Design a binder for this molecule. Structure first.
Ligand SMILES: Nc1ncnc2c1ncn2[C@@H]1O[C@H](COP(=O)(O)OP(=O)(O)O)[C@@H](O)[C@H]1O
Ligand SMILES: Nc1ncnc2c1ncn2[C@@H]1O[C@H](COP(=O)(O)OP(=O)(O)O)[C@@H](O)[C@H]1O
Ligand SMILES: Nc1ncnc2c1ncn2[C@@H]1O[C@H](COP(=O)(O)OP(=O)(O)O)[C@@H](O)[C@H]1O
Ligand SMILES: [Mg+2]
Ligand SMILES: [Mg+2]
Ligand SMILES: [Mg+2]
Lengths: 520, 548, 538
């Protein structure tokens, strides 16, 4: 009435995306199948890697479902479910991140034609949620209660599909010793902190019973100190050893000029009193989070006392557990008993960077190896490969469960699901059998990357499960199919349980969605 | 002829202002504007309801099946639709249960009102019709009630309460999700049987901490609480029994600096020598009175200094950061400690009791646990919720808030007063309200009649979302109520309802053995606020907007 | 609702459309009502080309100025139909429609439906016809008195120009319809009078000519301008051939045949002109003071002007189509196209024919006819706008005096019919109601809307309308009881009531008929209009 136009009131804002119809949920499935296609050829040892460069021109080379999806800023809402399960699988277990993604995409891709039919959404979710309960129980029967024979074999399989798989003869021998230093019920991940060294060859690495940290600063009296101590003693400090303000303030009134000379000498008196208390206990190695001034390091440089600074708190916490000492933020409360010790000390040239080596302790909680390589991605790939393998042998100590690898777990579970679907209820026979053949995507693509024909493989797996009761899987060496127990290929069961639970939770999340709202 | 005069005397108001009167079918358009988002609610009610993706301008996504939650993020232009947003927001704040109903009922009252206004009924009579129907609706809800709880704590009774509530939001498996709530409700309640004390319960007591990884079956019920903190000095498993003591300080563990220009002043060298050692001896002397009381863990409220930390970890005193007000208050309720801001001796009566403080790897990050034991129970327990997708953690967490909100419904009224669910409570009111229309004379009878027709949406929605044909399932259910109460007592035709999965025909095998019911307090305010949503939209005949 | 069909559409419904119809009518009323009466103001229609024109008629003001509003287009179209059939009373139509919508909208705001309001206007309209047929008076026009036609013409021409020019021009209007009359057939043509546009001495120096006046002069100097006795001869075929319909060409065999084929065209010219020369000497040879003029519609060959110039023959060309009917009515001749048959009986007669050189052109004057059945009016003026002003004055004044002969009845003017019709439409007892408390609302609205005409005349004169109408009301209160039929008017000189019949103000019968009928129909349909819409493809 107040205007000749009379505009029609739109419900939502301008620019909001479309709504209900035909093809809304199918677009979310095709969006997941699109992301699933990129991670498709990266499966198994005979796969490939993915090269990505973001907007900031940071090069990265990897074949991990979490790392590839982390750098890619995914804006599609349904596609970020794959990002969440990858980080959830990477945070806890650290292996098989991909096998969780290429599996959830197949369940959603297998749910595509059922959604085109008149099947409701809840019927498909009830099938997977009822079938995954039997798959978890079936994997408990596939897994063994192994206790005999007292780590070595589990690490070789976790290093697959990336760089150090071929060098497993050298890296697995020292990687097993990394977790044996850690005792039960603690399992501290920060003690396995490893740093970057651009330059060198990966073969020249070695095992270290302690820590090796960069100094990150050149002091005036650094060269005067000896680099080799026969019986060193470590003492960790936190007080700032330099001439400056004492406690967060600076204001000094002086009336007489005779006392003006004494107040300056008092500052010189207390700073050497602070340093002399460190000298009297016989601490050869001095370490502090805060900076150390030139006055202190030259006082230590005269009488053969090494010192260093500019280190992080995470590095300091690794130093205490390696030497077995403690933190002392006051020089007056220093006692002889709290000083850590080791066998020897030697500063070595490593990639044009100096590192203070500690090794030979009788009881060390720390394993820290120097990663040297040609490119910055080589040292990064060796880190992620070891970080994924160290989690497997870490949790192998927590519980002793072993299942057959090479896609053998998926086939044995699928056969019982076909028997369970054959028996009862009629309607869900198509859904469970659809879940069965969709679960076989792991050995499907594992052989396609090997160059073998999938029909001859998949026909041999099904008809040979009777004599191949449980340990029946693929073998890449002889170009044939046989028992995996003789080949000594092992893998834990925790990757399989979390994969199906995360994949079943991922597909059921957006299967209960038929809408998409995007404001602005 | 080439151009109109374009609404003269339009300069009375600005060009951006527009009027919208009842004529020109605009009230029909407002009903159609409700119909746009109301159909979105059809596929979100019930156990087979489908969640919704809502991508905000910031990119924060929340996937959900609940009305009140989804309507917060959507920016709405139509004011009549915003009445439903604030009506459902009132439903979530007060009762925390029955928000789709507020949306699906009040939208259908406007739908059937589209037929009434088109027939020629005045708007004043329409409000009088639903108000007279509301007084009869709330009256009969108290009459057809069956069953009661009568016990605050029981293993089997809580399965009847929590399970029908969380069945709508993230149904999944029934037992693994219901046991996490029924175990946590028993921990926080002050039972105190045979004392005559007033019960008390807080919604903020039970709180869920989201941790990625794991699976839904690995979720456990923690007696205490949890944060993602790191001890500063050292970590301790604390295998020593003979329980430790707890002292809570809200001020930082440091020297109480002067609020007005705290600056050093040293006139001579004698003060320079003693000022460095004076701070060490002063901080040490304050820790002696604290350490002699046998305390081994202190929860700090703000940043702690390094000198104070050096004397705390000397005697093995754990340090915990809680840099906020509510995070510090929730922890005192567990151990039952009374904080004091002074840095002196904690009082022995005020010291808390915690047996063990463990630090283990759950989500890959460092977390600190405060599990109590059966002896010396505590309140404000937490639930470790494990899942793969962060979006699913958000909706399951709000399902616990809805379940915890349902436990609040037992404290204020005299008891439980459960009703039959699965559409049985809605379909019974259709016959009672229809009979009420026949008893009253006047032109308001059509308003009473259409009020009953609006209640068919609950069985029609559950039959549509369940993948069944509503034309056959709905009238098959009417046969149970068209055979009305014969001369025999103890008639069991009231428990007939719809069924999502199973037998043909659909009248469910009772909602009985199934153990699904509804709360009276939810239905009272839901029908009240839903009628107010339709009252305010139908009572207004002119709408004025600005800038659009 | 209309925006869903066409977003580019608009609609005003049931309150905004009513204000548009009433405000556009009142806005059109407030601008155009000032021209009503003799004291009205003059408007200057200055277009983009700089053409200046003075007028007071609402037809030409609305024709040149395009109307943007949709309501006023319907009122302008009503003024067109009024000016078309009648030629007078356009200002009364727009004032009645504006006042009827004003008085009606006063009651629509009181909660009355437009249907019964328009029902009262139609009953009030039919009641006015039963009042009008009794109010008129019959006179005998067989006497053909000049005094009645002068005062009737003076009433119509005073509303166009001031007094001194009206007295000069008011005999010209009465002289227009002297001989044009037929008692039995009752046929009277208005288009036979010819309006010539020319610049001369002044507007106040015009005069009436009995015979015809053409705007074409003699091409050759040798032909005589003064002719004492002329026999006209009507030609229609072109003496100068424009083009041969069948294509042809003269292909000569030798140079000797060139001038002979040029003479072949001379033979056909001499063939048709020889009968013209034979027609001259057939009447009488060597007769002084007896010319012979030829009026041709199409062009004349300049080569043939020497033949007409030797025999002293006046030849004119490029005459108008409607003038061919006017020649036989004035001169008493007979129209002819070809020259196959000729005789002295078909020829007309004229007592005096002369020409005058005014500027770069010459005008032919033919006067002194025996029994001419037509005439002409020279519109002389001192400018361009006075010609159009006097042309509109004559074209509006010819219809007022011509209607007296078409129908002998005539209504007194000076607002006498509008004042007398107000009382008659006050109380319809049991004559024509139709319903209780419904039709009477429209009867009151129609009665009050008719009295705006005498009030508008008083507003232009500069006196109070309520004061001068109070004595008019008091006069007619005692006139009914005095047992004497008396018609009262409105005198704008002193501001006092008057007698139209005594003073000399009259209105035509067909003006009030079409004005009340056209205004009531447009006022009814605009009240029934509840919504305005627009739609189309740009
Ligand atoms: N030595 C091996 N022989 C056969 N199959 C293997 C071997 N090592 C790994 N696999 C298979 O490769 C699959 C993927 O494991 P892996 O490469 O460690 O992680 P990702 O899933 O990220 O590729 C597993 O399902 C496993 O069965
Ligand atoms: N398994 C089931 N069988 C039959 N009816 C059910 C089942 N689960 C839920 N319902 C019914 O569906 C209705 C959904 O209520 P709803 O408004 O979604 O609750 P909330 O307020 O928690 O969202 C309930 O009132 C209940 O009666
Ligand atoms: N001299 C006059 N005195 C009083 N009224 C007059 C006079 N001349 C004209 N009128 C009134 O003006 C009205 C319209 O006359 P006129 O102006 O000639 O037509 P129009 O308004 O169409 O130009 C007539 O109804 C008549 O009553
Ligand atoms: Mg791997
Ligand atoms: Mg509920
Ligand atoms: Mg006139």
């Amino acid at each position: 009435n107040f205007g000749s136009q009379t505009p029609t009131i739109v419900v939502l804002k301008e620019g909001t995306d479309a709504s209900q119809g035909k093809g809304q949920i199918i677009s979310n499935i095709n969006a997941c199948v699109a992301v699933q296609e990129a991670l498709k050829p990266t499966l198994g040892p005979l796969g490939s890697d993915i090269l990505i460069v973001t907007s900031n021109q940071k090069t990265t080379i990897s074949n991990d479902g979490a790392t590839i999806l982390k750098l890619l800023d995914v804006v599609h809402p349904a596609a970020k479910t794959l990002v969440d399960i990858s980080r959830a699988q990477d945070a806890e277990v650290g292996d098989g991140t991909t096998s969780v993604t290429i599996l959830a995409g197949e369940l959603m891709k297998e749910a595509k034609p059922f959604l085109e039919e008149g099947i409701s959404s809840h019927l498909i979710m009830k099938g997977y949620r009822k079938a995954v309960s039997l798959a978890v129980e079936k994997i408990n029967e596939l897994a063994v209660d192994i206790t005999s024979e007292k780590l070595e074999r589990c690490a070789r399989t976790a290093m697959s599909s990336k760089l150090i798989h071929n060098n497993a003869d050298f890296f697995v021998k020292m990687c097993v010793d990394a977790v044996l230093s850690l005792d039960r019920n603690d399992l501290d991940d920060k003690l396995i902190g490893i740093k970057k060294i651009p330059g060198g060859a990966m073969e020249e690495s070695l095992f270290i019973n302690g820590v090796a940290f960069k100094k990150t600063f050149s002091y005036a009296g650094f060269e005067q100190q000896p680099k080799k101590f026969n019986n060193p003693k470590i003492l960790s400090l936190n007080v700032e050893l330099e001439l400056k303000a004492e406690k967060d303030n600076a204001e000094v009134r002086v009336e007489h000029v005779e006392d003006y000379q004494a107040i300056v000498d008092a500052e010189w008196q207390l700073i050497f009193e602070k340093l002399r208390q460190v000298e009297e206990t016989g601490a050869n190695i001095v370490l502090s989070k805060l900076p150390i001034g030139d006055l202190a390091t030259q006082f230590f440089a005269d009488r053969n006392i090494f010192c260093a600074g500019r280190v992080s708190a995470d590095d300091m916490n690794r130093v205490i557990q390696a030497v077995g000492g403690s933190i002392q933020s006051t020089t007056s409360d220093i006692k002889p008993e709290h000083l850590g010790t080791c066998a020897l000390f030697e500063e070595m040239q490593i990639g044009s960077e100096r590192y203070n080596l500690f090794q030979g302790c009788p009881q060390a909680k720390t394993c820290t190896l120097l990663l040297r390589g040609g490119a910055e991605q080589v040292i990064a790939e060796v880190e992620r490969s070891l970080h994924d393998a160290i989690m497997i042998v870490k949790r192998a100590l927590q519980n002793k469960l072993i299942v057959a690898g090479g896609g053998a777990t998926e086939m044995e579970v699928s056969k019982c699901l076909r028997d369970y679907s054959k028996t009862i209820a009629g309607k869900q026979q198509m859904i469970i059998n659809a879940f069965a053949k969709a679960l076989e995507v792991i050995p499907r693509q594992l052989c396609e990357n090997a160059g073998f024909d999938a029909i001859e493989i998949l026909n041999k797996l099904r008809l040979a499960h009777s004599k191949g009761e449980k340990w029946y899987g693929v073998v890449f060496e002889t170009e044939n199919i046989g028992d995996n127990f003789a080949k000594f290929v092992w893998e834990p069961a925790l990757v399989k349980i979390n994969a199906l639970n995360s994949a079943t939770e991922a597909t059921n999340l957006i299967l209960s969605v038929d809408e998409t709202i995007t404001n602005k | 002829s080439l151009r109109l005069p374009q609404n003269p005397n339009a300069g009375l108001f600005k060009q951006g202002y527009n009027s919208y009167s009842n004529a020109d079918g605009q009230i029909i358009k407002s009903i159609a504007a409700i119909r746009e988002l109301h159909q979105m609610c059809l596929t979100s009610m019930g156990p087979c309801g489908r969640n919704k993706i809502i991508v905000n301008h910031l990119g924060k996504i929340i996937i959900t099946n609940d009305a009140a939650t989804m309507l917060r993020e959507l920016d709405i232009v139509h004011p009549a639709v915003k009445v439903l947003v604030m009506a459902t927001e009132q439903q979530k704040i007060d009762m925390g249960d029955g928000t789709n109903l507020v949306m699906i009922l009040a939208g259908e009252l406007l739908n059937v009102s589209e037929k009434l206004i088109s027939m020629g009924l005045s708007a004043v009579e329409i409000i009088q019709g639903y108000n007279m129907a509301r007084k009869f609706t709330l009256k009969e809800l108290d009459e057809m009630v069956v069953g009661e709880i009568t016990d605050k704590n029981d293993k089997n009774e809580l399965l009847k309460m929590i399970k029908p509530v969380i069945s709508s939001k993230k149904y999944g498996s029934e037992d693994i999700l219901s046991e996490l709530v029924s175990e946590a409700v028993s921990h926080v309640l002050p039972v105190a049987q045979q004392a005559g004390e007033i019960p008390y319960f807080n919604v903020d007591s039970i709180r869920v901490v989201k941790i990625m990884g794991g699976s839904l079956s690995n979720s456990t019920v923690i007696k205490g609480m949890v944060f993602n903190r790191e001890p500063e000095g050292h970590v301790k498993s604390l295998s020593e029994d003979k329980k430790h003591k707890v002292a809570v300080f809200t001020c930082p563990l440091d020297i109480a600096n002067t609020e007005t220009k705290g600056t050093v002043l040293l006139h001579n060298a004698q003060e320079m020598l003693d000022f460095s050692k004076g701070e060490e001896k002063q901080i040490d002397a304050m820790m002696k009175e604290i350490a002699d009381m046998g305390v081994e863990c202190i929860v700090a409220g703000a940043g702690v200094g390094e000198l104070a930390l050096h004397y705390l970890n000397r005697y093995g005193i754990l340090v915990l950061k809680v840099p906020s007000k509510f995070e510090l208050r929730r922890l005192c309720r567990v151990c039952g400690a009374t904080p004091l801001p002074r840095l002196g001796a904690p009082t022995p009566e005020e010291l808390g009791l915690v047996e063990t403080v463990k630090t283990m790897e759950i989500g890959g990050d460092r977390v600190t646990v405060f599990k109590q034991e059966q002896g010396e129970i505590s309140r404000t327990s937490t639930i470790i919720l494990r899942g793969a997708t962060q979006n699913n953690l958000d909706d399951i967490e709000r399902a616990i808030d809805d379940g915890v909100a349902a436990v609040k419904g037992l404290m204020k009224p005299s008891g439980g007063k459960l009703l039959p669910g699965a559409g049985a409570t809605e379909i019974e009111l259709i016959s009672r309200i229809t009979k009420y229309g026949e008893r009253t004379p006047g032109l308001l009878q059509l308003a009473i009649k259409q009020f009953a027709v609006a209640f068919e949406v609950v069985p029609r929605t559950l039959a549509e979302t369940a993948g069944l044909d509503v034309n056959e399932v709905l009238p098959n259910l009417y046969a149970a109520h068209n055979v009305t109460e014969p001369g025999a007592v103890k008639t069991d035709h009231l428990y007939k309802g719809v069924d999502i999965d199973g037998e043909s025909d659909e009248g469910v095998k009772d909602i009985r053995e199934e153990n699904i019911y509804d709360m009276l307090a939810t239905k009272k305010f839901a029908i009240n606020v839903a009628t107010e949503a339709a009252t305010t939209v139908l009572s207004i005949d002119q709408i004025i907007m600005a800038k659009k | 609702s209309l925006q869903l069909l066409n977003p580019k559409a608009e609609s005003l419904r049931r309150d905004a459309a009513l204000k548009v119809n009433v405000t556009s009518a009142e806005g059109l009323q407030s601008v155009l009502e000032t021209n009503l009466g003799p004291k009205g103001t003059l408007k200057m229609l200055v277009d983009g080309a700089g053409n200046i024109k003075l007028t007071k008629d609402g037809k030409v003001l609305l024709t040149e100025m395009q109307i943007q509003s949709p309501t006023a287009v319907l009122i302008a179209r009503a003024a067109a139909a009024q000016d078309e059939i009648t030629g007078d009373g356009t200002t009364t139509v727009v004032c009645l429609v504006g006042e009827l919508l004003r008085q009606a909208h006063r009651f629509i705001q009181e909660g009355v439906h437009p249907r019964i309001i328009t029902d009262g206007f139609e009953i009030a309209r039919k009641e006015s016809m039963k009042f009008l047929d009794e109010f008129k008076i019959s006179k005998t026009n067989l006497s053909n008195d000049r005094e009645f036609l002068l005062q009737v013409a003076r009433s119509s021409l005073l509303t166009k120009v001031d007094a001194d020019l009206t007295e000069v021009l008011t005999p010209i209007v009465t002289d227009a319809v002297l001989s044009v009359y037929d008692a039995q057939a009752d046929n009277l043509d208005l288009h036979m009078v010819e309006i010539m546009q020319m610049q001369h001495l002044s507007p106040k120096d015009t005069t009436f000519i009995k015979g015809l006046v053409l705007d074409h002069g003699g091409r050759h100097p040798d032909m005589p301008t003064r002719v004492k006795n002329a026999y006209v001869l009507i030609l229609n075929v072109s003496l100068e051939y424009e083009k041969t319909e069948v294509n042809s060409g003269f292909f000569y065999s030798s140079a000797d045949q060139r001038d002979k084929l040029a003479a072949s065209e001379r033979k056909f010219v001499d063939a048709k002109l020889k009968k013209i020369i034979d027609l001259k000497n057939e009447v009488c040879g060597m007769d002084p003071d007896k010319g012979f003029v030829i009026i041709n519609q199409k062009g004349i060959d300049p080569m043939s002007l020497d033949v007409f110039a030797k025999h002293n023959i006046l030849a004119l060309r490029r005459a108008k189509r409607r003038n061919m009917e006017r020649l036989q009515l004035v001169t008493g001749g007979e129209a002819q196209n070809s020259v196959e048959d000729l005789s002295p009986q078909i020829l007309g007669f004229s007592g005096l024919v002369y020409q005058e050189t005014i500027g770069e052109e010459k005008f032919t004057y033919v006067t002194e006819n025996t029994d001419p059945k037509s005439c002409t009016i020279l519109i002389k003026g001192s400018t361009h706008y006075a010609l159009a002003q006097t042309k509109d004055a004559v074209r509006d004044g010819l219809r007022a005096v011509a209607n007296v002969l078409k129908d002998k009845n005539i209504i007194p003017g000076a607002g006498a019919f509008y004042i007398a019709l107000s009382r008659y439409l006050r109380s319809a007892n049991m004559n024509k109601l139709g319903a209780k408390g419904k039709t009477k609302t429209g009867i009151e609205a129609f009665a009050e809307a008719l009295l705006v005409i005498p009030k508008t005349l008083v507003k232009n004169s500069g006196f109070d309308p309520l004061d001068v109408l109070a004595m008019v009301e008091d006069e007619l209160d005692d006139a009914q009881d005095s047992d004497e039929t008396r018609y009262v008017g409105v005198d704008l000189n002193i501001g006092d009531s008057c007698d139209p019949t005594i003073e000399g103000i009259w209105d035509s019968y067909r003006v009030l008929r079409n004005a009340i009928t056209g205004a009531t129909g447009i006022a009814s349909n605009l009240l029934l209009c509840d919504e305005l819409l627009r739609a189309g493809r740009s």
